Design a protein around this nucleic acid. Structure first.
Ligand SMILES: [Mg+2]
Ligand SMILES: [Zn+2]
Lengths: 35, 53, 166, 319, 50, 53, 90, 293, 126, 261
RNA sequence: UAUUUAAUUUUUAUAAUUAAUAAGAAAGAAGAAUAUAAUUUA
RNA sequence: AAAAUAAAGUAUGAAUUAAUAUCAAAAUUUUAAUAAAAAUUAAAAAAUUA
């Protein structure tokens, strides 16, 4: 499928959201409840 | 129901056998002893021209 | 704007009625097919043709002048004797001419619709009959002439007006 | 695999949906309509004589009816019911002009009286005529003559009296007294208490208000007028068996079946040993349902006098 | 239950004969008295053509 | 030959149908009146001489 | 070019033209000074029992353009807390 | 089974009707068919019924019974009292989804020990970019949702034109959602993530690693309404960065997603209470999580 | 052996066997202009018909048309047809060019633009 | 095959085979009472269907309908022939009750307007009557049956005379459940159209309508139906009615067939 | 290689009114290539 | 099925093959033996690759 919605990607913009930060956040919520 | 070859081979066996019409086909129905039911063989109730002559 | 939420506005001033109509005839809205045509020898159907596999989904039928044209026809479509059309007696004579010409020019045929043509032409005649006894100038002859020209272009010649000019 | 055309279903599932009794996309062309009008032996008459009115019903014209009467009075086949049928056919004329159309009613009256001595039929009829002609004294006089003759006034005589009483513009309780006296007599049998029942009769009359009125069923004069019914296969029933229009020689046979004694079947009864089962009868096309109704020579008028006044339009007759 | 408004005995706590002929009320439909008006049957209840 | 005379005949036919008849009557009657117009000529008449046809 | 798709090829724009001709009715009921949304009568008998004696229901919905016109114009009121702060059970 | 109960149109009439059958004279509803005003158009062998004891009485019972036991018949009220428009009809209404991005992968545990594999989707800016109804026809309505605010010069000039016309800030991407007229939200609306409920199911359409794929059942796991994330108990086959079109899965085998038992959506869209400011709010307390599977 | 595609003569109303009689020709045509065709008998045995001319007929058509549209008013198609009839009656020649051509070329009278480049009935050096 | 907008109602589209793909006809294929049959007359559907209500045809049938414009909801019909403030009497009809009791066949809500005082009636009459074929005249609530014939009226062949006297012959015959002591034949002197007259436990008398061309069995039929109606009418005064030996309408019976071998 | 299918004709803001079971300026590397749309850089 | 090698490419440039009209797609029946032969109904766009 050659359409625009499907071809274009958001990779370049990922710095706008802090993936590492949130992963560590839910690791904190991982140890808080004791998993 | 047993399929007879023509109308003449039809017959009423019971006191309770009746003649009945199934869409232009003549038949015999028995409300008691259903083994008595006889269809005069003819075209299917739903046929087209190409499909059944 | 001029149909849905402010329907009165077009009847109020005939000036902008004829303006919209004429701009609408200038771009040719009722043959969208010649928007997509690069050579008049191979006329494109881009506006008129769809397939179920989705060719021309974007360029497919767009109601474009539909509501506008039909609506501003229904402004002239009051044929009832109880009330003559309210905007037509608000029109200057040459205005009437140019709005008839507008209709005549919007259609893909290049010929106005019968009811409209009849209404306007007949409104114009009853104006002309009254005015010709009063104050009159050579200019107003020009108006009548280029009325009669339009009339012939829409293929109804007006025998009345013609025999007025001759 | 388009599913709009070849759906995913068994033919076993799908064959309930093949209509074997099809209604709307009809099987009778227009060309045939006229033909099947002749096959049944019906005749086209000039609009003066009568016509097929809006409900596709053949109705005679008044002044057509009176003439038929005037010719056939002494005929052997003419029965006492035919008289009252004619009198009924005269009512609109009677109301629109009570002076000159009442005399006809009295011709029928006296004539009937000397062919068949006196009857309920004739007295009911003329008293209803007087009820529309708005003569009350004529009605009471009539009723007295019934009782004096030994004729026991019928339930319809009391309804005639309530009608006369009403549309002659007389107060309530003259009609109420008629209804109550009629119920004491054992003519009218009412199931509800008297007041509400009487209200029902009054409401049923005011719906029915007379020919001259501003409101009523009889007050509607528009009649879709046709020389022939615009559909020949119209049903009074459920099936095509029960069809409204039937041959004149069948409509004779059933009239025979009616007037002959009841030995095989019940009558005047609600049971009907043989029940209506149109769906049980033969469903299939006969050859006349393909080639069209069989041709019978069209009904023709030999040596009809030349149509003078062929230009003039005849007036729709309620007159 | 699965029963229709007609045929349902009360609201308090078919395929073999598809058509019916409508019922007049019981005490009315046993012998039904004939009354002319100008060629219409007029009852306290119903109207007809005859 | 058949294609062409089919065409001619078709034309004459429609030109007759304007006047409420058809080839089937006009052929016979043209023969009976001893008129002897070839079909091609009735076509020439129908198209170029309507009043005469 | 099968039969069906040529048919629809020709007739789709004619369907559009015809329903447009249906539309212009409201337009001449507009220009004359009246403004009304042509109303659909509410259908009371949607509840049925078929030959096999079981309950069948007919779903009939009626869109209101005067509601819609307001729904495209302005925001909804604030989302109730009963919705988002508690989950939707499975 | 997967078929409803069949009913033919020849069978819906007075005798098959569940509630009383009603005849429509057009000004008035009565339980008697309309008697034609022109009496001479009456048919032979046809009764005109002004009054009928049988049918009128049954009706009489029904009504008084409805009023004196309103607690038993509160369902019957559906017959007489239809729901107005808007107001989220459970059967009628369809809302729009929103446009996501497959960001990363994760691992979660439920109440018990279990290893979940979550894919995290990110909804950077979701606005309503366009309204489109096709020739005013019914059920043709679309709401076009855009994603990812983007610099002026990104698109080929003809896209930028589109966004200029609309009035929306320029987006990297758009997707249309077919909806019912009540689910409209005004063009330029900011969409949140809590437009989705944490317990629901969601239809997902993305690009496979290479045509378009659709996963229709997938339940929602966990939602960050700070970082505008969303989590799914799935491993997609998709590239990181891939835009994904989200929708509500409208029914699962005879069952509506939205009902009183299960719950109700934030209907046209989620809208935030004006008092809250995400700028004062941390990541953890911003969590919304599902009930146990 | 190929199927026949040649054009068929259309089916005609059935005759009632009264056609078997002599003196009753089986062509039945009685039309509006029928009385206008007068018959005379030539000494040859040939006949001689007297009829109205082309444009007398066409003008009759015009009268009927105008008289049909007097009530409701002429729609565009009636206007076009009346126009064409009128021209055919006065023709004097044969018409070889598309009727629409003259309108296409003259369209600038109908649609007027802004006054800068606006076109008039003579242009250059003005 | 579902594209475009798909409504959450679980299966609307299933019966036409899962697609939304045509839908723009106002016309369909119809049995009697289906859509375009709106305009043709049919005995049944004429009184059983409002002809604004005819919908689409066969397997294309509307489980779901979406239309636009304002909705007009007309107020429900109000009941005729009852004056306001009138406090009615309520009846309790249950399936618990068998069909043998008159308590099934009558008004479920009983007003004081609908109660006839002509006859003594505490509660209004019934609205529906059972229908069977009565082979024999059997004493029901009748205490006497009088048959009056003038022998001076005379004729040969089948006449109403013969019919009435045959009524008598049947009532007094061996196989008749009617007690033979309660049937009274009366020869009248002057020219009486033969009449049958039955007198009930109420003291009210009924005269069956001997029609021209009436036969024996019609009179029997009539007298028995009428006897049910009057049994009810008496039940409405509050008379206490003893059960009947013979049951014409067989409520508790199944149709039995004989054996095979 | 002819037919026949399956794919492709290199970002289409958007997709489904029907058939059957869809297309805006252009070619090197799609990566300045060691997974950041520049890790500060002479 | 991972690993190694080989396929857009500039340049060079053969061989089998070749009755053909810009082509021959789908189905049904018939005809002296597949019948790309007939007849009927039908609905096959171009380029490139497997
Ligand atoms: Mg030759
Ligand atoms: Zn048997």
């Amino acid at each position: 499928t050659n359409r625009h919605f499907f071809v274009a990607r958001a990779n370049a913009f990922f710095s706008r959201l802090p993936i590492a930060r949130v992963q560590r956040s839910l690791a904190m919520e991982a140890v808080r409840e004791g998993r | 129901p047993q399929m007879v070859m023509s109308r003449d081979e039809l017959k009423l066996r019971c006191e309770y056998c009746r003649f009945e019409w199934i869409h232009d086909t003549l038949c015999v129905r028995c409300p008691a002893q259903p083994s008595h039911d006889q269809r005069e063989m003819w075209l299917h109730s739903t046929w087209m021209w190409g499909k059944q002559q | 704007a001029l149909v849905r939420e402010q329907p009165w506005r077009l009847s109020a001033s005939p000036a902008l009625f004829i303006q919209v109509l004429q701009f609408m005839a200038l771009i040719k809205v009722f043959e969208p097919n010649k928007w997509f045509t690069f050579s008049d020898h191979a006329p494109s159907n881009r506006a008129d043709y769809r397939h179920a596999i989705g060719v021309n989904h974007s360029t497919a039928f767009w109601g474009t002048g539909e509501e506008l044209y039909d609506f501003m026809v229904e402004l002239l479509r009051v044929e009832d004797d109880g009330r003559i059309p309210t905007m037509l007696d608000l029109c200057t004579r040459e205005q009437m001419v140019d709005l008839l010409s507008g209709f005549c020019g919007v259609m893909p045929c290049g010929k106005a619709v019968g009811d409209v043509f009849k209404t306007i032409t007949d409104a114009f005649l009853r104006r002309v009959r009254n005015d010709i006894s009063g104050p009159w100038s050579a200019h107003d002859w020009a108006i009548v002439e280029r009325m009669y020209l339009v009339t012939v272009l829409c293929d109804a010649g007006n025998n009345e007006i013609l025999q007025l000019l001759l | 695999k388009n599913l709009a055309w070849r759906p995913k279903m068994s033919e076993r599932t799908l064959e309930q949906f093949v209509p074997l009794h099809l209604a709307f996309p009809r099987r009778h062309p227009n060309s045939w309509q006229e033909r099947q009008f002749h096959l049944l032996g019906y005749v086209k008459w000039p609009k003066e004589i009568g016509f097929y009115n809006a409900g596709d019903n053949f109705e005679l014209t008044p002044q057509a009816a009176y003439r038929i009467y005037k010719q056939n009075c002494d005929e052997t086949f003419w029965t006492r019911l035919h008289n009252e049928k004619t009198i009924i056919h005269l009512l609109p004329l009677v109301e629109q002009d009570p002076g000159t159309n009442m005399v006809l009613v009295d011709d029928i009256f006296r004539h009937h009286l000397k062919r068949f001595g006196a009857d309920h039929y004739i007295y009911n009829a003329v008293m209803q005529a007087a009820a529309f002609a708005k003569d009350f004294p004529r009605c009471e006089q009539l009723l007295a003559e019934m009782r004096g003759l030994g004729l026991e006034p019928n339930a319809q005589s009391y309804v005639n009296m309530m009608l006369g009483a009403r549309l002659t513009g007389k107060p309530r309780d003259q009609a109420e007294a008629f209804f109550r006296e009629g119920i004491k007599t054992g003519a009218i049998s009412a199931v509800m208490r008297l007041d509400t029942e009487f209200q029902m009769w009054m409401n049923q009359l005011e719906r029915l208000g007379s020919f001259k009125a501003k409101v009523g069923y009889l007050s509607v004069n528009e009649e879709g007028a046709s020389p022939m019914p615009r559909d020949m296969w119209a049903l009074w029933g459920w099936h095509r068996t029960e069809a409204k229009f039937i041959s004149r020689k069948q409509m004779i046979s059933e009239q025979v079946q009616n007037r002959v004694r009841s030995g095989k079947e019940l009558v005047g009864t609600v049971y009907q040993k043989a029940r209506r089962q149109p769906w049980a009868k033969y469903n299939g096309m006969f050859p006349y349902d393909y080639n069209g109704p069989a041709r019978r020579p069209a009904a023709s008028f030999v040596d009809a006098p030349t149509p003078t006044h062929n230009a003039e339009v005849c007036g729709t007759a309620y007159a | 239950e699965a029963i229709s408004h007609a045929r349902r005995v009360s609201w308090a706590p078919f395929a073999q004969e598809p058509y019916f002929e409508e019922e007049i009320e019981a005490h009315r439909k046993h012998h039904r008295p004939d009354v002319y008006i100008y060629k219409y049957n007029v009852s306290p209840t119903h109207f007809s053509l005859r | 030959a058949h294609w062409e005379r089919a065409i001619v005949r078709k034309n004459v036919d429609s030109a007759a149908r304007e006047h409420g008849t058809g080839w089937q009557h006009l052929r016979n009657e043209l023969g009976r009146q001893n008129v002897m117009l070839l079909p091609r000529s009735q076509q020439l008449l129908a198209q170029y001489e309507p009043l005469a046809f | 070019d099968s039969f069906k798709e040529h048919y629809h090829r020709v007739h789709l724009p004619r369907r559009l033209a015809l329903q447009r001709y249906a539309r212009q009715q409201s337009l001449r009921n507009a220009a004359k000074g009246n403004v009304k949304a042509e109303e659909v009568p509410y259908k009371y008998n949607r509840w049925w029992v078929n030959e096999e004696h079981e309950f069948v229901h007919q779903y009939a919905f009626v869109e209101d353009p005067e509601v819609t016109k307001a729904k495209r114009e302005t925001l909804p009121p604030v989302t109730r807390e009963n919705i988002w702060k508690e989950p939707q059970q499975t | 089974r997967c078929y409803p109960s069949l009913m033919r149109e020849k069978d819906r009439d007075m005798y098959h009707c569940y509630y009383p059958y009603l005849f429509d004279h057009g000004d008035k509803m009565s339980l008697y068919p309309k008697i034609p005003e022109n009496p001479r158009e009456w048919q032979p062998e046809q009764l005109q019924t002004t009054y009928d004891a049988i049918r009128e009485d049954k009706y009489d019972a029904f009504i008084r019974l409805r009023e004196k036991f309103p607690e038993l018949y509160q369902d019957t009220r559906a017959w007489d009292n239809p729901p107005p428009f808007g107001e989220f009809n459970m059967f009628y209404s369809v809302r729009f989804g929103m446009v996501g991005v497959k960001a990363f992968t994760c691992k979660d545990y439920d109440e018990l020990g279990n290893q979940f594999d979550c894919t995290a989707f990110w909804f950077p800016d979701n606005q309503v970019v366009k309204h489109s109804t096709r020739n005013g026809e019914v059920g043709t309505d679309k709401v076009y949702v855009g994603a990812m605010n983007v610099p002026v010069e990104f698109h080929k000039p003809h896209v930028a034109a589109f966004y200029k016309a609309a009035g929306v800030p320029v987006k990297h991407v758009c997707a249309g959602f077919p909806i019912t007229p009540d689910a409209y939200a005004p063009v330029g609306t900011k969409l949140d993530v809590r437009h989705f409920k944490p317990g629901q199911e969601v239809t997902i359409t993305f690009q496979n690693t290479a045509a378009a794929e659709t996963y229709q059942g997938v339940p929602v796991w966990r939602i960050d309404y700070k970082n505008s994330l969303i989590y799914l108990p799935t491993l997609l086959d998709a590239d990181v960065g891939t835009y994904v079109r989200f929708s509500d899965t409208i029914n699962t085998k005879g069952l509506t997603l939205w009902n009183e038992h299960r719950g109700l959506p934030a209907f046209p869209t989620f809208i935030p209470p004006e008092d809250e400011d995400l700028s004062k709010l941390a990541t953890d307390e911003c969590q919304l999580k599902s009930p146990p599977l | 052996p190929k199927k026949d595609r040649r054009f068929r003569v259309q089916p005609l109303p059935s005759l009632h066997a009264n056609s078997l009689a002599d003196d009753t020709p089986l062509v039945t045509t009685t039309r509006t202009l029928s009385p206008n065709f007068r018959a005379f008998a030539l000494q040859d045995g040939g006949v001689f018909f007297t009829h109205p001319s082309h444009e007398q007929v066409m003008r009759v058509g015009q009268n009927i048309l105008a008289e049909e549209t007097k009530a409701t008013g002429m729609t565009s198609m009636d206007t076009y047809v009346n126009s064409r009839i009128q021209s055919i009656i006065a023709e004097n020649t044969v018409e070889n060019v598309a009727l629409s051509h003259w309108r296409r070329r003259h369209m600038w009278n109908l649609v007027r633009t802004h006054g800068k480049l606006q076109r008039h009935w003579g242009v250059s050096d003005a | 095959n579902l594209k475009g907008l798909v409504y959450p109602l679980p299966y609307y589209a299933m019966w036409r085979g899962n697609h939304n793909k045509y839908t723009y006809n106002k016309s369909t294929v119809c049995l009697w009472g289906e859509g375009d049959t709106r305009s043709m007359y049919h005995q049944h559907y004429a009184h059983a269907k409002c002809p604004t209500d005819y919908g689409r045809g066969g397997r294309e049938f509307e489980y779901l309908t979406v239309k636009r414009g304002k909705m007009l909801q007309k107020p429900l019909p109000r009941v005729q022939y009852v004056a306001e403030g009138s406090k009615p009497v309520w009846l309790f009809k249950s399936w618990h009750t068998p069909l043998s009791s008159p308590s099934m066949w009558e008004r479920e809500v009983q007003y004081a307007e609908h109660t006839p005082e002509h006859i003594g009636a505490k509660r209004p009459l019934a609205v529906v009557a059972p229908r069977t074929m009565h082979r024999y005249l059997f004493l029901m609530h009748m205490e006497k049956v009088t048959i009056t014939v003038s022998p001076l009226l005379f004729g040969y062949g089948h006449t109403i005379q013969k019919a009435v006297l045959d009524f008598y012959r049947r009532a007094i015959s061996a196989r008749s459940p009617f007690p033979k002591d309660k049937v009274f034949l009366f020869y009248a002197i002057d020219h009486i159209t033969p009449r049958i007259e039955v007198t009930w436990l109420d003291g009210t008398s009924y005269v069956p309508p001997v029609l021209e061309g009436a036969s024996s069995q019609d009179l029997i039929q009539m007298v028995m139906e009428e006897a049910w109606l009057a049994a009810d009418r008496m039940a409405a005064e509050g008379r206490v009615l003893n059960p009947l030996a013979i049951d014409d309408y067989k409520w508790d019976q199944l149709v039995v067939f004989k054996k095979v071998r």
